[PDB]
Amino acid sequence: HVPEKEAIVDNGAHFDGEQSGTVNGVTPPAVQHLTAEVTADSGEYQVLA
């Protein structure tokens, strides 16, 4: 036994979706405060990042 009023109810939207756009995916952001220092110790130049 099959009814005919099924394609109407089947062509119904899902639970909205609630945006869920790409925007950003898991990719980490840029590291902040990239300070680099120049020092003179033991008569030698050193740099620290």
Binding site: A13, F15, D16, E18, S20, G25, V26
Partner: protein, 232 residues
């Protein structure tokens, strides 16, 4: 042990037995129907059998295959009912093929029926001696224009059920509406597709984050906001 009274057990020792009578009660209140009382046979007056004051009407009913066991599969006895004049089909077309109801089988001895079933009148009547079983209808394996066969099952039988009912979700709720976890009791605000309605007959949650935000119960959301656990 069984809840068998002393008198019926004592009677069930002698050689000259009485007549065994089986009566059936189909209860559909839990599903949306009524209580039907059936007996395979009628009294000597051509009248429905009177037991405990109530009446069981005659109708061809036959139960076969009652096998209680602890191992192997469960018990699935078969109940056969005559479908004449379309009487069974009438409720089957209405009560979703008699699925989910309860059946109660009571067996009694002849010498304990009500006095109105005998022309002389039984002086040994005792409307408290019977053996009772209950089962649930599982499916209507075959209902033709002359008969109808139902499969029975134990209420506590497990089949197709899993133990850890909890399921971890991302953006969908897991429980019902207003039942125990959605402690919402205010006016209707949303509907199936998250539309701003204020009518109570159409208030059903969409099982989303937006529904919770609409109903201000996001603190009671069952969907953990992980999502991105497998991408990284």
């Amino acid at each position: 042990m069984q809840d068998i009274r002393q008198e019926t057990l004592n009677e069930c020792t002698r050689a000259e037995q009485s007549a065994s009578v089986v009566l059936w009660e189909i209860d559909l209140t839990e599903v949306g129907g009524e209580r039907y009382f059936f007996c395979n046979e009628q009294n000597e007056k051509g009248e429905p059998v009177t037991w405990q004051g109530r009446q069981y009407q005659p109708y061809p009913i036959q139960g076969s295959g009652f096998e209680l066991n602890g191992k192997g599969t469960s018990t699935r006895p078969t109940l056969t009912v005559s479908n004449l004049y379309g009487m069974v089909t009438g409720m089957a077309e209405d009560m979703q093929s008699l699925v989910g109801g309860t059946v109660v089988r009571r067996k009694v001895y002849a010498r304990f029926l009500d006095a109105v079933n005998f022309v002389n009148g039984n002086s040994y009547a005792d409307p408290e001696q019977e053996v009772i079983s209950r089962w649930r209808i599982e499916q209507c394996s075959e209902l033709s224009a002359v008969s109808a066969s139902f499969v029975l099952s134990t209420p506590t039988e497990t089949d197709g059920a899993v133990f850890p009912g909890r399921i971890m979700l991302a953006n969908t709720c897991t429980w019902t509406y207003r039942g125990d976890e959605c402690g919402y009791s205010g006016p209707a605000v949303a509907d199936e597709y998250d539309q701003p309605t204020s009518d109570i007959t159409k208030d059903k949650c969409s099982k989303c984050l937006s529904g919770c935000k609409f109903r201000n119960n996001v603190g009671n959301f069952g969907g953990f906001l992980s999502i991105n656990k497998l991408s990284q």
